[PDB]
Design an enzyme around this catalytic site. Sequence first.
Site, PDB file in Angstrom:
ATOM      1  CG  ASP A 269      15.500  12.218  33.972  1.00 56.78           C
ATOM      2  OD1 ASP A 269      15.001  12.178  32.863  1.00 56.78           O
ATOM      3  OD2 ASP A 269      16.464  11.415  34.170  1.00 56.78           O
ATOM      4  CB  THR A 270      20.005  12.320  38.476  1.00 54.54           C
ATOM      5  OG1 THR A 270      19.813  10.886  38.280  1.00 54.54           O
ATOM      6  CG2 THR A 270      19.327  12.785  39.778  1.00 54.54           C
ATOM      7  N   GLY A 271      19.350  11.712  35.093  1.00 50.86           N
ATOM      8  CA  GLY A 271      20.034  11.242  33.841  1.00 50.86           C
ATOM      9  C   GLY A 271      19.703  12.228  32.723  1.00 50.86           C
TER      10      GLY A 271
END
Lengths: 5, 99, 99
Positions: B25-27
């Site tokens: 999860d890049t966020g």
Amino acid sequence: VVXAX
Amino acid sequence: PQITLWQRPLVTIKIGGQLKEALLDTGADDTVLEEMNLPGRWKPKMIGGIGGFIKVRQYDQILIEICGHKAIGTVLVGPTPVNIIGRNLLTQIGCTLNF
Amino acid sequence: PQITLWQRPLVTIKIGGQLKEALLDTGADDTVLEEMNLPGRWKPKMIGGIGGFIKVRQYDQILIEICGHKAIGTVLVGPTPVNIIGRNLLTQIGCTLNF
Ligand SMILES: [Cl-]
Ligand SMILES: [Cl-]
């Protein structure tokens, strides 16, 4: 769904 | 490997000799795992999400293997919809977003 | 471009003549924008995450330019702390996760 600060 | 986003980017992680599924999860700044027994002391940490802020327990120096890539870092444990591997560990295994 | 994750992967989006900043989130099924008026009819939806669920208005087939590339998709608008580009539009631009 969405993911954190 | 190169991961497309047609489906949630779910990978197998090994933690405490156990296999689990986690989302890359890049966020996510941090790595948050669903409630689990981890070793050592934890410290308090507040995190914000789409719904608001929650309290989590913070553990340092947790070894995690993500697709056989070994990572050692901070792991947060609290009520998460799914195990999420955040940028703290993503940068450790050399993950980049490309387009 | 190849974005590293040492920082939040933020890019500028052009949506309905407005230039905005948004997070490339591989952990988001859908794109959620901060409160704004978008033309066309909408449907209420609930989206969840860390901290629970928020109610958003869903707009279909909205055009967004992410880093110059055009993408059409569903766009949710709601009380989100940050603009988020989700999987639904990331796929559209050819975004991948590599390691
Ligand atoms: Cl870390
Ligand atoms: Cl869509």
